[PDB]
Structures are given as C-alpha cells and as structure tokens.
C-alpha cells in the first residue's frame, strides 16, 4: 500500500549507492529487487537496516513513502473533515449521522465523535444523544484501563471542551504524571490535556487544580526526548502568570501575563492573541479589575467583528 521500495531506490540512486550496498548481508539480490520494486513486502526490521545503510532517517523514509499524511486510512479523512464541517456547519447533519453510530468502534472514532459534538455546541446545534449517553460511553471506554495511549489524551482533550470539568476530572488524574515519551504526536496530545485543563481550572479560580496541572506540565520538561510544544509552553506560561496573580495578587505577574499576550501579537499569532485577550478580560472581570487600555481596547474590537470565535484545532 506504501511505495516504500520506490523510496529506497530513489534515495539509493540519489546517494549513488549500489544495490549491493543494501541487500548484501541482509537479503538476496533477487529478493531485494523484489522489495525495491514494491512487489515484495518489507519488514520494519529490514527497512531499519536499509535506513542505516542509506544514512537517511527511518521515519523520514516512511514519511516520504506516503505515511507523511494522516489521510492514508479512513479515520484520517474523517479528522480532516472536522475542520471542514467546522467552517461549513451545514454539512454537520449528514456527516454526524454517520459518525455518531461508530463512536465506540475504536478510540479513533470516539475522538472524531467528540470532535463533532464540539462543532455542535459551538453553533448551538442540538445533540441530545450526547448528554444522554456520554457518561455511559466513558464508563465503557475507561473502566478496565491501566495505561493510556496518544489517542486517549486526544479524547480527554476534546472532552474537556464539551463536558463540565467535574465530570472529566476523575478520568484525567489516573493519566498523570507522565513518565516517558512515545512520539511527537504523543508528546503533543499529552500537553493539550494539561493546557486545556489548566485553562479550565484558572477560569474557575480552582487554584488547587491549576497548580496541579502546572506542576504536571513543568514535569514534562524533565522527561528525556519529549518534544515540548513552543506555543503551548508560552500560553501555559502565561496561565502560570495569571495563576500567581490570583494567588498573591502580585502586580508584576499580571504585567508579565499581559506582556506575553503582547508577544503573540508581535509574532503574528492572530487567534492566540484574540483568545488570550478575551481570556484576561474575563478573568479580570471576575476579579474586580480593569485590564490596561489596549487589552480592553482589542476586546470590543474583536467581540464585534468576531462575537463567536472558532476554537483552536491542531491536527
């Protein structure tokens, strides 16, 4: 299904290596030509060795082979469609009718399911089957669970967006602290849960939790080979500032938070800026405060030519 052989040849010939330089020691010149022709399957072990002989990254080879796009299988297409249905809420119905029934078919489809449920709440679309069956679904998915995979964190990240924090709380706790890295994808979803949960805590002034998520994130920087996402690290760090402000009413912290929000504008992160402004506004309100003239200036400017923004979506 993946023209891996094609890639081996391409890389081999570009690098000027001869077939002998690859199959010698590994396999027969006849069978290798069968591999490089995309007629005979290749084991990850074989590919692993060819990768070492070529001097090109294993994963890069896979990517070049066509696995560099999560559109290789069913679920892939469905996730890409979420973005589409999010800006074209008219395509919701017919599509949601097809996903809803398969929501428990695999963690993949459930993540996709929650994906639609998000679009619905956003566009104030009625999804009665949700409120009626989610607690059941979760019970079914997370009951005899001991370890969690990347999609697990993905699911909980989206869950935090369509379910009151209190219901999601108990499901999260057994998923941290994290002890190892298992890929960029895994490292990314494990940070999203933390980042969304830290946001919810702060918005609820639930500082005991916010503190917890901050420590959990901080801990991730300790783990070897874990790719800490820049943006998140910046946005989480901003939440850290507002956290210190709610704690010791320290003004420096508030300034730093505002200053961070500024940087997002300076570097071009339009949505993140819009997002954190509307956020610092609300949190300041609940605190009997009035943010600086600019922060408060952007707000009305956004909430008018925006009113109801689309949440961030990573893929």
């Amino acid at each position: 299904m993946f023209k891996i052989g094609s890639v081996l040849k391409q890389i081999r010939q570009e690098l000027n290596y001869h077939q002998i330089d690859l199959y010698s020691g590994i396999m027969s010149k006849s069978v290798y030509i069968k591999v490089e022709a995309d007629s005979r399957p290749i084991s990850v072990e074989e590919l692993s060795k060819f990768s070492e002989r070529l001097g090109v990254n294993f994963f890069e080879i896979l990517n070049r082979a066509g696995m560099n796009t999560k559109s290789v299988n069913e679920t892939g297409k469905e996730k890409l469609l979420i973005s589409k249905i999010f800006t074209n809420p008219d395509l919701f119905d017919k599509n949601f009718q097809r996903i809803e029934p398969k929501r428990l078919t695999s963690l993949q489809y459930f993540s996709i399911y929650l994906g639609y449920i998000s679009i619905a709440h956003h566009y104030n679309i009625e999804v009665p089957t949700f409120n009626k069956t989610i607690t059941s679904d979760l019970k079914h998915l997370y009951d005899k669970r001991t370890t969690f995979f990347g999609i697990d964190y993905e699911i909980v990240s989206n869950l935090l967006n369509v379910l009151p924090y209190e219901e999601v709380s108990s499901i999260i706790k057994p998923m941290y602290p994290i002890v190892d890295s298992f890929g960029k994808d895994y490292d990314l979803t494990i940070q999203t849960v933390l980042k969304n949960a830290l946001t919810i805590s702060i918005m609820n002034r639930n500082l005991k939790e916010a503190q917890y998520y901050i420590n959990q994130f901080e801990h991730l920087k300790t783990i070897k080979n874990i790719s800490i996402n820049g943006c998140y690290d910046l946005e989480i760090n901003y939440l850290k500032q507002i956290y210190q402000f709610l704690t010791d009413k320290n003004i420096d912290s508030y300034l730093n938070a505002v200053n961070i929000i500024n940087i997002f504008k300076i570097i071009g992160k339009e949505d993140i800026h819009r997002s954190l402004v509307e956020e610092l506004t609300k949190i300041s309100a609940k605190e009997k405060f009035t943010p600086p003239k600019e922060v408060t200036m952007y707000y009305e400017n956004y909430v008018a030519i925006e009113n109801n923004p689309i949440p961030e979506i990573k893929e």
Partner: peptide, 7 residues
C-alpha cells in the same frame, strides 16, 4: 483556551 486536537 481549549485547543481541539485531532492528530
């Protein structure tokens, strides 16, 4: 805010 992740 709440980032929707679909990797």
């Amino acid at each position: 805010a709440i980032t929707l992740i679909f990797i």
